[PDB]
Structures are given as structure tokens and as C-alpha cells.
Design a protein around this nucleic acid. Structure first.
Ligand SMILES: [Cl-]
Lengths: 347, 349, 345, 348
DNA sequence: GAGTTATGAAAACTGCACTTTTCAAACTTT
DNA sequence: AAAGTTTGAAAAGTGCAGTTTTCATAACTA
DNA sequence: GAGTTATGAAAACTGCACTTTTCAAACTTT
DNA sequence: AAGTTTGAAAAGTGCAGTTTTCATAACTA
């Protein structure tokens, strides 16, 4: 059903009401692929509708995110920040929901996104655009008439070079690891280095995703739409580690043919993987702007284009939906325009 | 017979009433071709003629499926999940409780899907959607009051959201070797080897091999012609060179005499009845692991893909693929007509 | 937006009301790509926006079809014939629209489709299914309740073989033609034989659809989705005829680079093309079950699979969306299953 | 600002009022990069407010398009057609659906499309749909009563290989035909130079027509040509001098007698820039003469030819993007695309 | 020990609604 | 005719709203 | 003359709903 | 060891529905 824009006497509570409706809608529309507990999500939907305060909305959205509904985090906090800005006590422009305009929103962004990055500022703006677009489509009185806001509010990533990649690979075997985790951790990080696959892609690998032929592994990676993409790496890079780890793995209560697992048998967390990557980066003395697994992913793509000069190959290997993403790992010398002008006089 | 939409005071109980009617209709409309015990299905239909609880509906449909009515599994579980959802959600979705079946709309169904399909495959989501669409399409067509007028749901759910796994010629050779090389007990070795080999060479489906009968085997010009029963009184044929199974077939038929099988069924369990896909899969996967060919799919159907692929690589005849596999549509046969190594070598000089 | 099932006291008149609504909807949903006069369509929709008699519905739907809205012809006549059936049976024995069921519809099909082909019978049934499906979706009373019908009502085509094709080609040049039409007609029919393109495809060909390279023409054929498919043809088959006709073509007031045209300068009709093809068929002594341009299309597809045994090749050349369509030009020998069993060796 | 949905007695004239409001907004939001004489546009923005007839609105939209505001053409004509539909349908049929703006819905719009897009291409139909959706989305966001409440249409409408080019051998024949075909002494040097520059660099029609001599820089036998883009941004292409050396010097001498405006390299007899229409005619004329007539016979087809050849020669997708000036690599990817003889030989 | 849970912040993607452009017949001028 | 321009028509091209994931640290358990 | 207009009939396609099956972990029996 | 039950994940297809052409009559030029 639809609701009138203003149902309550208190404008701040009415704003909170629309924010709750919006965040609840997003919980039902955003991806649920990583939801671990279906029952917690169901509870969240009801608890969002029963919420009467900002702190309550915050708690339930956190509950939703921690249950596997990751996408909600981008929308929740920014809108709760705006509610705080709107509800702030003042003396002597905030007595109605219809007073909210682009002037007010611009002021809010300026105050609340001061020491935040440009990317974070973008997220805040997107969240605002989503909320008021929702309100415009869902508010309505008995005359089937509505109030309309119409709010619009109108290069190489950090990486390791070839030589630094060599040192990093050496450091994986040179750094100290306990006997319980050394085989597993070295295998996990090296696969990421040699394939450039994402963090969650590596942590969710299965044994049956692996096939060996002519001294080279083909690894299938499950993606969106349940579509698989393939990556290849030479067997000798991980043959010794894989043989060693599979033996140790037999002592674990591992579930669903999962390759990497903790002692309990479940998949490792991003937090654990990051710290294992970062401490090796430190040991190698290679600390920079970014120091995690995705930084290694940027490194593989950069090296791939440097070695092969094939943009399509980068797209297919990295799993980019568009070549415009693959472009980020390239730089064009303007003098090379001469190569295009020379096609008429040489093959 | 048509019924009024709401005959009870409890909407949750009224929902159960329509679900039971729908599931009984599907049992009579969906294929009963694979049903062995007809009496069991009749008993199921008898129970579904009365009002049943959720627990009772679950038990009945399971009994029907295990009897041979396979199609019911696609509709049964998702709708029982929705009843479970509706019984608790109708009270706490909003401040005011949903006290009527008319409160069920497209938004509610969308929310049910998002919650109950979290973490499941895209294919599973589609099955749930199809199940929900079928139920309320049925209600729209079978409900009416005294004046022959009906309530219409009109649920639409407009939101809807390479080469298959196989073994190449070299891998197929290694698999055939492993069939004879792997350890099997004397009681099942002859039967299982013959069963799996026929699948590999002909590419017939699992149930087709499990339902093979002795009278459908003919030998001429050093080649077998195997007839496979299809829809109704239809039969499709496959051919297989004699020397591939002639030794095994003779050996198995001898040992088959010790089994208490009541008919001319070729393959049978220790009790005499037909083997299941579950046992066939386990034996196939076991040989695959032994050969080190473990991958995305490790069943008999993967061997079926391997046959279709190899057939197209050797003859390049799409019509031949259709006739050999028994495809009704050439859009299926077309599938078997479908530079990462360069990226993997960058680490070397 | 929606109307009660029964608004009038007379059931027969109320039936015409729903038929008129359905036919108006189809004039809005069916393809208008072939419409030549937009003003005629404008007049048709205006007339269909009110209550019409049976004769009026027939006249208006005919006007729409003749204006280029071809699809409407499949729905109009069968439904108007049902109204005639309903009116007669009501007076002889039907008190309400609710009385219409599958038993009644089955009897109608038995009486009115007698002597007609199975394909024609199928068209009648499809029209009935469309009407009552529409009514089920559009009827509603003041209480938001509706009546539901739920009506369900539950080998190689004629061609010329290789030898007959050769005789037909010779007959095109051998038969007598007027000097004013000979060059154009010979080229038009030969292109159909050599490419197997549809009738309307040949009639709407443009000069710039032709490109010549290394003694071979590539003809681009515009089809569904406004997408083009390519067919190739050896130059020596039509190059002389093409050069001759283009010269003669300069005498015509033809526009938009249209290849074939009448003396007025516009595209030729299907009626003229059929009669030209048919008289050559009769002259060659090749008359059979089908004698038009589409029979030549079936002949091309049959020959293509015969000489190449490539089903994909047939699909792409003929412009089939699915391979199941191309299948009808194939004949599988059941003994060839041994060829599939010998792949292991 | 915002206005009440219904201010006029005649809903037909009220419809035109909203259409005029919408088109004026598009004139101020769509690109004004190709706009020379900005005062002519400010003139149009005023005449858009004053337009109270279909003829007045049609005239100013054409005036705006001529001024360089090209994007308006996609929206103006389809909405002028709908106004024509609404107007005559109301006066003739007198159906209740035309007695108020509120009675316009998806059904009415569907009937309009079936009538006014009959015999038209699918691409054109998509343009008509976009224009209709844009109009009523604008009205939903700009209408208000005294109590700041709005009527909402929420209109939704049901949805509806290598590009044509010359290969390397065909490009050779085309280049020869440029010099072989007959041209008058007045235009031969100008036309040959203009077309050859397009062939060798693959730049767009408008880019070539707006070239200026000051943006040319010769160094060691190779030209660097700057091409003006959006804002203050320029892109560059390179061109070997021997391709155009003779033609360039010859044309510049003839150019001395022209009353050239804005320091343009190419111009008409009056001194102003040549149009795409004239450029197309000259290219098509050579194409026909060379016996290369195909599905597309303009300068953009020559552009497709350059990109296709460039990728076949070097297999460098980034090089293609930079040389052609593609903003998106999805466009550059098209030139990586691509057994019909096997079916044509069945008659032998 | 060998890892997890929680979290504000900062990206890392994805695709289509919409913008921007030329095609090419009809028309006008010198 | 040569030398152009106007115009309906038909695309050709892409910026940015919107979705999904990781960064990188604190607080746990011992 | 060389074609068009009109028409009931007879196809010639096109595409996606939804029916039917196996996968494969968990569970049971001889 | 030798099986079956079961939630889950596909594998596969018949038919509603759309868009032509067939083939003849009746014309005029
Ligand atoms: Cl590249």
C-alpha cells in the first residue's frame, strides 16, 4: 500500500518512518546470495517495521548486514546521519517534510562528509537520491495525489610491480608460519597472486572446481547469475603445496567439498586473509596505500597487460563485464598515434 | 467442482485447503509414467480429497514421489514453505494483522521469495516462482461464490531474476579402464560394470538404462539394437557394437538367475526390484575419483554429455546427434557445437 | 478500464460488444510495420472505439488489413462466424454469456470448419482461445469480482527436385515475355530461385543491398528486428540480367533505390509475382500442390541440405530463428545409427 | 517554477502548453557544444514561452536545431505528432477520454503509436517511446496545486557483426576514384582534400567540417591535428604529410579568394562551414562511381572502414580507442568482430 | 593459538536509460 | 545544372544511477 | 497493354511457459 | 556393503500466439 507523506505531528518521527520503509524495501530487493541465516533476515523485516527510533533502525540494519545482507550498509548509516541533522535542536525551516530541498541536503553533505574520501561522499549522495526517489513513488493521499521532491543533486590503482611481486612471492615462503596453517595459508595467497581472483572467490573455492591437464590447472569460479568463469595457472606453482595441504585437510570436519577451511570446517573470513597478506607485505617491506588481497588482484591485471598487451585477455582473466574496467590498468603514449597513421604504408 | 475463496474463519487453514486441492490436481495432471505402485498413488489421492494439515500434506506428497510420481517434488516443498511463512507473517508484517486470503498480493510473494531463497541457486529461485504462479493461477480458475463470480489474484511476478561438463576422448579412455580396474565385490561387479559401460557407449539417460528389459535386446551383424521405452507406446533405438558388452552380458545373465527378480528387468537390486539413480551415481562417482577425473559433475548424465560431444566431433552431424541422444528439440543438440594459457605463462621468462 | 461481463439484456448484442473490444486491442498490439496508410488506421481505431454491428466489424477489419495491418485477418472472420452461430442457436432451441462453454465451442468448430484444412481449423481455435482469454482478463463487476471461462480446448513440403529446378531455370529464359517486362521479371524470379528468399523480401530489395567482389554477389536481406541476413550468389548467374535491367530501370520514376518496380515506380505486388511464377511452372509442366514463389523457397532449402548436409547452413541462409524449422527439410535413415556406434573405434 | 496541471479551458491547448514547457527545458539541458551564435538560442528560449500554436512551436524547434541545438529533434517531432493526434481525435470523435489531461493513459498512447509509427522502423519507434515517457515524467515533476500536491501519470510503455565498411582492397579503389572522378575547378581541390583527410584519419563528419588550419602542426613529415571537443577539451590525430601535401597547398591558394569565417579550413562560397549534407553527397557520388555502393554510403562508413583496418593491422584495442576518439571501449570492441560460399556453390 | 564477529569507511564494480550524431531524400539557391 | 541547405528518419554512442564487495582496525577467546 | 485491389483460405514461422529429470548429501537396511 | 530418501539444481519440450503467402475473382490500362 501507499502512505500519505505526513501522517504524524512530529516531522522528525515522520522522516524516520519513511527511512524505515526504504531500508526495509532494500532488504527485500538487494542481493541475498550471501545470507547465512534466512530466519534472521525475516526477523529484520518485521523489526524494521516495528522500529520507533533511530538507534533501533541502526541495530536491525546491522543485524541484517551481519546475517549476510551486505548491501544494506551502504544505505543505512548515511540516512541515519541525515535524520540526526534534521532532528538537531535549534532556536528561532525544519517544521515540515516539505521543507527538505536540495539546499538543505547540500548543507548536510558539506557538514557530515568533511573528512571523508571522494568515494565515500559519492555513497552518501547516492543514498540520499535513493530515499527521496522512493518517497516520491510511494507517497499518496486519498485523492491519489502526491508530493514530489525530484532530488537530483547535480590513474593506476595501488599495486606491486614485477620485481616487487617476485620479492613478495619469496617472502611467503621466508616468513614464519605455524605448522598448522603454513601449508594452507601459502597455498591460498599464492593462488590469489597467480590468478588475481577476488577475496571471496578464493575463500569459496571447491576441490571439484579444479582440473589438471598437461601440467596446468583450470579453476572454475562461480559468479553472478550462477555463471562460471575460468582461470588457468601452471601446475608447478602450487603442486607441492596442494599435495601437502590436502593431506592435512583430511583431519578437518570440512563441509561441501570446500578447499580452504578453518579448524571447525567452515570457510575462512576476509579478516583472517587480510592479516595474513598484510604481515607478509610488512615482512617484505612493501607497505603502501593498500595492503590487502585486492591489491594483489590489481597487481596481476597490471602485469598481465604489461606482458601481453591484450585488453581482451585482461577482461576474460579478471572477469570484467566491460572493457572499460580493464582500461584502468593501461596507459597510452600519445606519440603512438603515429602507429595508426602508418597503417597505410606498412602491413 | 469449484469452491468459494474463503470457507473458513482461519485464513491460514483456508490456504491449506487450496494448496491441498492444487497438489492433488498436479498429481493427476503430471506424468504418472514412472509409477510402479499404482495402489500407493490411489491412497495418496484419497487422502488429498479431504482437508489435511501441513504435516499431512508433506507426508502424502513424499509417498507419491517415492512411488514414482516424480513431478510433484517441484511444487510440494515450496508451497508448504509459503504456508509456514504466511501463518507467522500474517500476524506481524504490519500493525494490523492480515486476516484474509485477499491480503495475499504480489509484494508479499516477492518478500517470501527474497527470504526463503537466500543462499540458494538461481535455478531454485525459478522453481519457487513457477510453483507460486501455479497455485494462484489455479485459485483464480477454481474459486467462485453463489453468483458464479470470482476473486482474481492475477499474480505475474514479472521479475525473473558454453559447453557442459564432460570428458574428452583421452579422459573417456581412462574412465573405461578404471571400470575394470577398480575393486568391486563379486555380487555386484558383473552387474555394475555392464550397467555403466552401456551408458558410456550409448549415452542413454540414467532411468533409461535402469529400466532396460531383456526382450528389448537384439543381436545382428555383430551389433546390438537396444530398444528404450518412451512416452506412451513409443520406443527409441540405440546401436552398440557387440564386443563391448557381449562378455559382460553373458556373465551377468548367469548370476542374475540367483536374484529373486519377478520379471524380465535386466538390472535389479538384491530384492529383485529396479536399481535407483542414487546407487548408479555413487558407483559412477567412485570410478571417476579413482581415475582422478573429478570435476563439476560426476554422474551418468555427465557421461551422456561426453558421448554427445564426442559424437559431434567425429561425425559433425547435428541430425545424427539428435537421433542418437533422443532429443525432441534440435536446440538441445546445438549446445554440443560450442586464450587463458597465454595469461598463465606471464610468470615465466 | 474494465467492463461487466453482462451490460446488455441481449446476450448476442453483448457478445458483439466483447468481440469489438478484442479486435480493437489486436489492431493496437499486432505489427504495423507494413502499414502504407496511417490515416486508414486512425479511422479504424476510432470506429472500433464504440459499439459496432457485425457487418461494421467486418468492414473495418478489412479496411485495416487492406491498409497494411495484415495480422487482423486471422482473428476477425472466425469470431464473427461464431456470433452468427450463437445468434441462430439461441432462437432455435443460450440465455446468458455464461452459458458459453467448451461443448458449445466444439460444436461450432464442427459445423463451421467442415471441409477446411487442419491448418485453417487450427487458426479458428486460436482465435477463440484469444477472445475468451481477453474476456477473462477484462471483465469485472462493481464488487471487483469476475466471471472466468478458462477455455483451453485441449513430410517434406511441396518442392522441385534438382532436375526439375534445372528445367524451371531454362523455362524462365525460354518462355515468351513482353519486351517491357522481360528483363525485370527474369531477374526477379531467378534471384528467388538462387537465394530462396521470401516473397516480400524479393519485392522490397534495394540496389544497395547488392555488393560484388571477386565474381560473387552478396545480397543483404532485411528481416525481423530490422536485422539483415546475408546470402551469396555467383556473378555469372545474374550479372548480365542485372546490368540490362538497371539500364531499363532508368525509364521508371522509381525512388528510394528500389530494385524492382511497376510502371508507376512503386513495389510490385504478391499477386503479380505469383502469376508470373505460376505461368512458368505451367509452361515447364511442373504444376503441383503449390505453384508460387514460396514453393521455390522450399526447393532451395531442400537442395541446400541435399548437397551440403549442413543444417546450420540451411538455418542461416533461409533465416530461420530455430533449427527445429530447418529440420523439416531432412530425412534420417534409421540404419545410420550404426555410424554413431562406430565412433569409439 | 511549477504550475497547476490544468490552467486552460481547452485540454488540447493545455497539452501544447506543457509540451512547450518540456521542450524548453530540453533546450537548456541538452548539449550546446555545436551552438554558434548563442544569442540565437536565447532568442529561441523566449519564443518557446510565447509559442501558443503547433506552427509556432514547430518553427522555433527548427530554429533551435539550425542554431546547433541538434538534440531537440529527437523530442520535438514525436510530441508535435501526439498533439496533432490528440487535437483532431478530440474534435472528431468527442470521446470522453479527451475532455481532460488526466484521461491520458497507456491505452491512449498505445493507440497513438500504432497509428503514427505505421510503416516506420523499429529504431524510430523507440525514439517515439522515449519522447512520450520524457514528456509525462516531466509533467509529474512540475505540476502542483495550491496545496502543493501533484497529479501523477507514472506512464510506462512496453519495450520494442562488423558495421558496413570497405575492406583494404575496396579502400584502395575508393582512393583512386577520388582523383579519377570529374569535379569542377571551383570545388575539386577542396572536396578531394576534405574526403581524403576523413579516409586517412577516420574522424567524424562534423569534426572534419570544423577543422581549423591553426590546429595543424607539421614535424618531420607528419601532421598532428587537434580536434575540438566538449568544453575546452581537444583530441589529436596524426597524419603523414605525403598523403595530402599537394592538395593542401593547392586548396589554400584557392581559399585566398574566399570570404572565410572563423578561420575554418573548409568553407562554402559564402565563407561559412560546409554541411554534412553536402559532404555525404560528394562521398556517395564517388562511391557509386567506384562501383562500391552498399548499405551505407557516407563519411561515417569511411570511419568504420578506418577503425576496422586499424584493428586488423595492429590488433591494438587501446590504439583504436585513442585514434578514433571513443569514450567507451564497448564501441571499439565492435571492430574485433568477424561459410556463405559453401551454400552458393550448390548450383555448380 | 588460530582464528571470528563487528564495523565505519572506501572502494569495485554493473548496465541501461538517455544523450548525441549522421543518414539521406526532398528542397532551395546561384 | 552546380552548389549548396532543410528535414524526417534512423540510428550510434555513453554518463551516471545503482549494486555488490573489500579495506583495515578494535575487541574478543586464554 | 501491365499490372493493382481485394479476399477466404492455408500456411509459415516465433518464442517461452512449465513439465520432467538428475545431482548428490544425508539417511536406512541387510 | 548395499542400498533408499530427500532438498536442491537443473534438463528439456509442446503449444499459444504472431506474421506471412496461397491463389483466385474482378477490374483498368
Ligand atoms: Cl588489445
Amino acid at each position: 500500500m501507499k502512505h500519505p507523506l505526513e501522517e504524524l505531528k512530529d516531522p522528525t518521527e515522520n522522516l524516520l518512518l519513511w527511512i524505515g520503509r526504504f531500508l526495509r524495501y532494500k532488504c527485500t530487493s538487494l542481493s541475498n546470495s550471501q545470507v547465512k541465516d534466512q530466519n534472521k533476515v525475516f526477523e529484520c523485516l518485521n523489526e524494521l517495521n516495528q522500529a520507533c527510533s533511530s538507534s533501533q533502525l541502526e541495530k536491525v540494519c546491522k543485524k541484517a548486514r551481519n546475517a549476510g545482507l551486505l548491501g544494506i550498509n551502504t544505505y543505512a548509516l548515511p540516512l541515519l546521519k541525515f535524520h540526526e541533522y534534521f532532528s538537531k535542536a535549534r532556536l528561532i525551516a525544519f517544521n515540515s517534510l516539505k521543507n527538505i530541498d536540495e539546499v538543505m541536503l547540500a548543507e548536510f553533505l558539506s557538514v557530515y562528509t568533511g573528512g571523508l574520501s571522494l568515494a565515500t561522499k559519492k555513497n552518501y549522495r547516492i543514498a540520499l537520491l535513493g530515499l527521496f526517489s522512493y518517497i516520491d513513488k510511494q507517497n499518496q493521499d486519498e485523492n491519489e495525489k502526491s508530493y514530489i521532491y525530484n532530488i537530483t543533486l547535480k590513474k593506476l590503482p595501488t599495486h606491486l610491480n614485477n620485481e616487487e611481486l617476485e620479492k613478495f612471492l619469496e617472502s611467503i615462503d621466508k616468513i614464519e608460519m605455524s605448522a598448522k596453517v603454513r601449508a594452507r595459508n601459502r597455498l591460498l595467497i599464492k593462488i590469489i597472486v597467480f590468478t588475481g581472483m577476488r577475496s571471496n572467490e578464493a575463500l569459496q573455492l571447491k576441490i571439484k572446481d579444479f582440473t589438471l591437464e598437461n601440467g596446468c590447472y583450470t579453476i572454475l569460479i562461480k559468479g553472478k547469475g550462477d555463471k562460471y568463469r575460468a582461470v588457468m595457472l601452471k601446475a608447478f606453482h602450487i603442486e607441492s603445496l596442494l599435495k601437502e595441504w590436502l593431506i592435512e585437510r583430511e583431519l578437518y570436519p570440512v563441509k561441501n567439498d570446500l578447499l580452504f577451511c578453518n579448524q571447525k570446517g567452515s570457510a575462512l573470513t576476509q579478516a583472517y586473509l587480510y592479516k595474513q597478506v598484510e604481515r607478509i607485505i610488512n615482512f617484505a617491506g612493501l607497505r603502501r596505500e593498500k595492503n590487502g588481497a585486492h591489491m594483489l588482484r590489481h597487481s596481476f591485471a597490471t602485469l598481465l597487460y604489461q606482458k601481453r598487451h591484450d585488453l581482451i585477455l585482461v577482461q576474460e582473466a579478471l572477469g570484467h563485464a566491460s572493457l572499460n574496467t580493464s582500461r584502468i590498468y593501461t596507459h597510452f603514449d600519445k606519440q603512438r598515434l603515429e602507429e595508426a597513421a602508418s597503417i597505410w604504408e606498412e602491413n
